[PDB]
C-alpha cells in the first residue's frame, strides 16, 4: 500500500499555478474591501457626532438623536438582511464554515452588498458587534465570486479560493496575517475529514490583503499596550487559575448567546417588521449608552489599552463587564449582521484585568502588574467560547506584541478549553452551524 | 449531512486519559531535552580543558582537537550502525514515517542510541543541529509511555507520538508555538485525515517548555534586540531575496541527498569503513573548530554577529560556502544529527549578505542588513524542508522582532514559490521517500 505514499510524498506541494495566481487576486480584493468597509464604518460613527455636538446644548435632544441615528441605522441594517439574505445576519462565519463542507451556499451576489451596507448600518450605528467575523464572510464571497467569474473548477480551486478569501479577510481586519492562516487550519477547515485546501495559496492571499490594508493604515495600531512586564515561573500557576475561570464561564456564555436568540425570536416571530423594529430598538439603545457610558456600547476596542493600564477601578470594571455581557448578547443574539468575535476580546481583557488586580494585592511578593493577566485573558474568551486556542493566542500576540507573556498566555488559554470541555460547552462557531444545518432539514 | 450535526456537536472531546499522558510525555521529553543539551555542552567544554591544556604546542592542539572530535564522532556513528541505523540522519523522517505507520518506533534502542550517539557527534562539534535529533528522542519518549501503559487505539497512538515530537522541537528552541505549528504543517500525515488530538499536544508542548525554563532562564539562544522596521517601499527587496532562496533551496536538496550516495561508496555499508570515515569528518570539524570556528560547530553563536553586520562581505561568503560543505559532508554522512538548526545559520548568513548589498545599492531606503538576516534565517527552512508557517513562527519565536513579520513572509513565500516552480521537494519527505522505497525491495 505504501507503494502509493512514495508517489504522494515525492509529489507534495505542487499547487496549480492558476489556483495560486487567483488567491492573489482574491487577497488583493478581500483587502481593498476590508479597508473600505472599515473606513465607512468610521465615517458613520463620525456623522453621529456632527449631530450630537451640533445639538450638545439640549440634553434630551442628544439622547434623542443618539437613538434615532442608531435606530435609523440599525433598522436599515436588519432590513437589508431579512429581506435580501437572512444569512448576512449573525456572525458571518458559521455560514462559511458550513460552506467549506458544501453544506451551505455562497450567495455572493446577495451576501456581498447585504453584509457590507448591512454592517455599516449596525456598526456605523455603534452596536456591540465586531466587524471581524462579518469580514471573514465578505472575504469568502469575494473568493467564490472570482471562482465563478473565471469558472476555475474542481474542489481544490473551490475549497482553496474560498478559504483564502476567509483568511485574507480575518487578516486585513486585525492586521494579523498569522492569526488568519492559523484560523482556517484550526477552525474553518472541515474538522472531520481530509480536504483539498492549498495552504500555500492562502499565504499569498493573506499577504496580498494585509498589504492593501497597510497601504491605507500605517503608523497606527488597533491595540497599543507597549512592553508590559515579564512573568516569573512562580507566578505561572495564577494563569491556570484564571484559565479555569474562563473555562467554566466560556460555555455558560455559550448558553446565553444561543438561548438569547431563541427568546429574542418570539418578540418578532420572524416578522420582517417586528424584527426590523426590534432592530432600531436594540440599535438605538446602543447609540444611547454610546454617550452615557461608552464602555457598555460600541465595538470595545478603544477600552482595552485603558483596561490593561489599570486605569479602571475594580468597580468600573465589574460594571463594564456585566453591562457588556448583556449588550453583546442582546446584540449578537438579535441576528443583526455583525461578529461576536471582537467583543469577546474586550470581554476577556476586562475579566482578565480584574483578575489581575485581585492578584496584584493578594501577592505583593510576586510584583505582578494586572496588565499581564489582561493580555493572558484577551484571547481566553476566544478559547472557552469559539475554542480556537492556537488562533486566539497568535492573534493576541499578533497585535499586543508582548511575546514574553507567551507562556502565561497559553497556560491560561489551555486551562480554558480544558475546563470548557470538562463542563459541557462546544465550539460556539460550530454549535451555530449545527442549529442552522439541523434547521435546514428537520423542517419539511 | 445528518451525521455532521452529531460530529459538530461532538467536537473537541478528547479522552481525559490521552491528555493526562501528553502531560507525562511532555514533562519527560522535557527533562530529556534538557539533559541532552547539557551533556552536549559538557563535552565541548572538555574539548577545551584539553586544548588550553596544551595551548603551548601548536600541532599538539590541531592533533588533540582532531582525536577528540574523532574519538567522539566515531563512538557516535558506531552506536548507530551497530544498534539502530535509524538514529542516523536527521531523526525526523523516521517519525514523519512512523506517523503513517510506515516505520517503527524502536524506542528501546533509538532512545539511548540517539542520545549518547549525538553527545558524540555534537559534543565533538560537527555541523549538525540537536533539534531534529530531539524531535525523534521525543516521539520515542511518547511511544515509550504508550507502551508502558498499553493505552490503545489510533488516537492514543498517533496523539502521544505527535505530542512527544513537538514537546521535543519545543523544549529545544524554547518555542512552544513553532513546535505545535510544525506537527500540524509537516509531521502530520500529509494526505489523509488523522486522529491527532491538537489539545493534547499543547499540554505537552507546555510541560516540556516549562521543564526547559526550570533549567534555562535569564538566557536566550539568539539575541539580536529590536532591529529597525521595514517600510512598504522596501517590501519588494524581500521578494527578490525570497526568489533567491527559492532557486537554491532545491539545489541544496540535491547536494544533501546526492552527497549521501557519493559518501556511501567510501564505506559500502561496512560498519568500519563508515565508523572510520566517521572520526574522519568528525575530527575534521574539531579542527576547523579552532582554525576558523565559523565553518564548524552548530552555528548558533555566529548568528547574532551576522545580524549585527560585524562580518565583512568577504568573511560572509567564505563562511557561507565553507558551511555549505561542512554541513553536507556532515549530514550526508548518516551521523546522528539534524540539518535543521544549521540551515538556520545558512539562511542568516545568506540573508545578511543580501542585506549588505542592498544597504548600499539603496541609501535612500535607510536599510539595516540585519533585517534581511532575519528575513532569511527561516528561508532555508522554507526552500528546503518547505515549512514556511513553522519557519516564520520559529524565527519570531526567538528573534522577537514581530515588526519584520511582513518582510519575513514575503521572503519565506517567494522561497517555496520558487522551489516549486523549480523542481524541489519537502527535503524531510524526499528522505522518507528513499528510506521507504528502499525498505521495500
Amino acid at each position, epitope marked *: 500500500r505504501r507503494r502509493q505514499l512514495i508517489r504522494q510524498l515525492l509529489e507534495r506541494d505542487k499547487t496549480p499555478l492558476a489556483i495560486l495566481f487567483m488567491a492573489a487576486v482574491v487577497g488583493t480584493l478581500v483587502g481593498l474591501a476590508a479597508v473600505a468597509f472599515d473606513k465607512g464604518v468610521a465615517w458613520l460613527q463620525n456623522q453621529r457626532m456632527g449631530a450630537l455636538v451640533h445639538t450638545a446644548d439640549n440634553y434630551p435632544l442628544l439622547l434623542t438623536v443618539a437613538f434615532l441615528c442608531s435606530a435609523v441605522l440599525a433598522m436599515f441594517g436588519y432590513f437589508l438582511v431579512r429581506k435580501y439574505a437572512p444569512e448576512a445576519g449573525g456572525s458571518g462565519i458559521p455560514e462559511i464554515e458550513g460552506a467549506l463542507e458544501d453544506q451551505r451556499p455562497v450567495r455572493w451576489w446577495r451576501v456581498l452588498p447585504v453584509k457590507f451596507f448591512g454592517g455599516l448600518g449596525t456598526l456605523g450605528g455603534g452596536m456591540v458587534l465586531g466587524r471581524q467575523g462579518p469580514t471573514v464572510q465578505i472575504g469568502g464571497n469575494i473568493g467564490r465570486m472570482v471562482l465563478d467569474i473565471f469558472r476555475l473548477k474542481g474542489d481544490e480551486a473551490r475549497h482553496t479560493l474560498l478559504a483564502t478569501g476567509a483568511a485574507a479577510g480575518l487578516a486585513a481586519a486585525f492586521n494579523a496575517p498569522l492569526a488568519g492562516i492559523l484560523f482556517i487550519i484550526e477552525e474553518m477547515r472541515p474538522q472531520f475529514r481530509y480536504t483539498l485546501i492549498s495552504i500555500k495559496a492562502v499565504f499569498i492571499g493573506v499577504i496580498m490583503s494585509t498589504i492593501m490594508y497597510r497601504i491605507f493604515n500605517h503608523e497606527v495600531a488597533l491595540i497599543d499596550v507597549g512592553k508590559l512586564s515579564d512573568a516569573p515561573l512562580n507566578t505561572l500557576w495564577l494563569y491556570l487559575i484564571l484559565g479555569i475561570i474562563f473555562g467554566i464561564f466560556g460555555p455558560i456564555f455559550n448558553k446565553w448567546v444561543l438561548g438569547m436568540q431563541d427568546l429574542l425570536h418570539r418578540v418578532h416571530g420572524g416578522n420582517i417588521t417586528k424584527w426590523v423594529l426590534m432592530g432600531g430598538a436594540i440599535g438605538g439603545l446602543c447609540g444611547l449608552l454610546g454617550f452615557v457610558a461608552p464602555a457598555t456600547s460600541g465595538g470595545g476596542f478603544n477600552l482595552i489599552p485603558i483596561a490593561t493600564a489599570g486605569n479602571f477601578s475594580m468597580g468600573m470594571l465589574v460594571f463594564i463587564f456585566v453591562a457588556r455581557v448583556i449588550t453583546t448578547l442582546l446584540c449578537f443574539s438579535s441576528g443583526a449582521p455583525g461578529g461576536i468575535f471582537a467583543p469577546m476580546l474586550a470581554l476577556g481583557t476586562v475579566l482578565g484585568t480584574a483578575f489581575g488586580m485581585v492578584a496584584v494585592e493578594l501577592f505583593p511578593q510576586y510584583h505582578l502588574e494586572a496588565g499581564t493577566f489582561a493580555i493572558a485573558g484577551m484571547g481566553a474568551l476566544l478559547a472557552a467560547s469559539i475554542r480556537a486556542p492556537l488562533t486566539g493566542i497568535i492573534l493576541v500576540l499578533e497585535m499586543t506584541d508582548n511575546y514574553q507573556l507567551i507562556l502565561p498566555m497559553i497556560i491560561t488559554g489551555l486551562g480554558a478549553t480544558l475546563l470548557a470541555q470538562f463542563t459541557g460547552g462546544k465550539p460556539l462557531y460550530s454549535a451555530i452551524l449545527a442549529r442552522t444545518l439541523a434547521k435546514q432539514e428537520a423542517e419539511q | 449531512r445528518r451525521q455532521l450535526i452529531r460530529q459538530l456537536l461532538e467536537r473537541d472531546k478528547t479522552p481525559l486519559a490521552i491528555l493526562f499522558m501528553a502531560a507525562v510525555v511532555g514533562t519527560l521529553v522535557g527533562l530529556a531535552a534538557v539533559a541532552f543539551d547539557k551533556g552536549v555542552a559538557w563535552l565541548q567544554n572538555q574539548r577545551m580543558g584539553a586544548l588550553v591544556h596544551t595551548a603551548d604546542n601548536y600541532p599538539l592542539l590541531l592533533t588533540v582537537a582532531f582525536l577528540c572530535s574523532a574519538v567522539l564522532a566515531m563512538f557516535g556513528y558506531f552506536l548507530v550502525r551497530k544498534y539502530a541505523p535509524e538514529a542516523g540522519g536527521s531523526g525526523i523522517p523516521e517519525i514523519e514515517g512512523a506517523l503513517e505507520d510506515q516505520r517503527p518506533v524502536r524506542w528501546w534502542r533509538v532512545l539511548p542510541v540517539k542520545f549518547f550517539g549525538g553527545l558524540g557527534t555534537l559534543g565533538g562539534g560537527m555541523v549538525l543541529g540537536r533539534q531534529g535529533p530531539t524531535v525523534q528522542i521525543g516521539g520515542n519518549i511518547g511511544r515509550m509511555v504508550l507502551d508502558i501503559f498499553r493505552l490503545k487505539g489510533d488516537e492514543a497512538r498517533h496523539t502521544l507520538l505527535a505530542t512527544g515530537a513537538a514537546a521535543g522541537l519545543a523544549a529545544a528552541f524554547n518555542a512552544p508555538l513553532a513546535g505545535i505549528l510544525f506537527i500540524i504543517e509537516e509531521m502530520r500525515p500529509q494526505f489523509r485525515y488523522t486522529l491527532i488530538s491538537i489539545k493534547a499536544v499543547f499540554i505537552g508542548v507546555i510541560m516540556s517548555t516549562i521543564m526547559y525554563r526550570i533549567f534555562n532562564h535569564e538566557v536566550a539562544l539568539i539575541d539580536v534586540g529590536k532591529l529597525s522596521d521595514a*517600510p*512598504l517601499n522596501t517590501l519588494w527587496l524581500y521578494l527578490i531575496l525570497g526568489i533567491i532562496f527559492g532557486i537554491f533551496g532545491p539545489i541544496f536538496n540535491k547536494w544533501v541527498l546526492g552527497m549521501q550516495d557519493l559518501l556511501h561508496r567510501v564505506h559500502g555499508g561496512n560498519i568500519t569503513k563508515w565508523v572510520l570515515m566517521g572520526g574522519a569528518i568528525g575530527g575534521l570539524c574539531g579542527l576547523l573548530g579552532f582554525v576558523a570556528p565559523a565553518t564548524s560547530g552548530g552555528g548558533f553563536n555566529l548568528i547574532p554577529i551576522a545580524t549585527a553586520g560585524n562580518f565583512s562581505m568577504g568573511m560572509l561568503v567564505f563562511i557561507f560556502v565553507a558551511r555549505v560543505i561542512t554541513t553536507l559532508l556532515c549530514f550526508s554522512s548518516g551521523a546522528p544529527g539534524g540539518i535543521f538548526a544549521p540551515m538556520l545559520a545558512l539562511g542568516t548568513v545568506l540573508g545578511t549578505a543580501f542585506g549588505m548589498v542592498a544597504v548600499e545599492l539603496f*541609501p535612500q531606503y*535607510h536599510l*539595516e542588513a540585519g533585517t534581511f538576516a532575519i528575513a532569511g534565517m527561516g528561508a532555508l527552512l522554507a526552500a528546503s524542508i518547505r515549512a514556511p508557517l513553522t519557519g516564520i513562527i520559529l524565527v519570531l519565536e526567538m528573534t522577537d522582532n514581530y515588526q519584520l513579520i511582513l518582510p519575513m513572509i514575503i521572503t519565506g513565500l517567494g522561497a517555496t514559490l520558487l522551489a516549486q516552480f523549480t523542481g524541489g521537494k519537502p527535503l524531510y519527505s524526499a528522505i522518507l521517500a528513499r528510506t521507504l522505497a528502499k525498505q521495500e525491495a
Partner: antibody
Amino acid sequence: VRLLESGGGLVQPGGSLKLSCAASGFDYSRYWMSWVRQAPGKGLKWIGEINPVSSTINYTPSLKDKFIISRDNAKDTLYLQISKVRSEDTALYYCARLYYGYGYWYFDVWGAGTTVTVSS
Amino acid sequence: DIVLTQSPAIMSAAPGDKVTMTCSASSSVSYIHWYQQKSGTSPKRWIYDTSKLTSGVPVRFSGSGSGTSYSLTINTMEAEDAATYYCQQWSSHPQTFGGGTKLEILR
C-alpha cells in the same frame, strides 16, 4: 518634542566649530538624525544623516571631512563638526528628526536653528 | 542629484482664491514632500508622499503630481497661508529641495 541645537556663531576662515543639537520629548534611538543648512536668502541643502547605532553616516557630495556628523545617544544629542570652514559655510544649521510614510523618507521635525558666520 | 525647481518663485493672490504652485524634477521622482516656512521659523512638514496632509494642516491644502512634475494646491487660500513652500524629494539619493515658492497675500 523639542529639537534644540546650539553651537553656532562666529568663526574665522579655516576654522572648526562643533554644532550641538539636544533632543527631548521622544526616544532618541529608533531615529535617524540629520542636518540641513539654509544659507541666508538661499534654500536648504542637506548636509548629513546618522542612523541610531551610528553604524551608518552619509554626507552630500562634499570632500573628505569637511563634515563629521556623530551622536551620543547617551545624551540624546546630535553633533556636527565642520573643519576648514569658508564663506560658503555661513548659513543657518538645522538638525532634523527623520521618518517616512510609504518609505521615501522625509524631514519630520526640524529643530530651531543655529547660525554660523564665517568671518574675521 | 535630482534638481527640483519650483515654478512660481514668488506669487500673490487674494484670500479665498484658488492658488497652485509647481515643482518639476530634472529626472524622475515619486512621493514628493512639502514644507511650509513662515518668517522667523524653521520649516514645517506640510504635505508628504505627494498628498498626505500632516496632522494639523488645514484641509484647505492638497498635494499632487507624478514622476516628473508635482504640485501643491490651496482651495481658497487664507491670509495665514502667507509663507514659503519647499517641495523636497528623497526618491533618489541624495535628497534634494526645491527653490521654494513665496506666497504673498493681496488685501
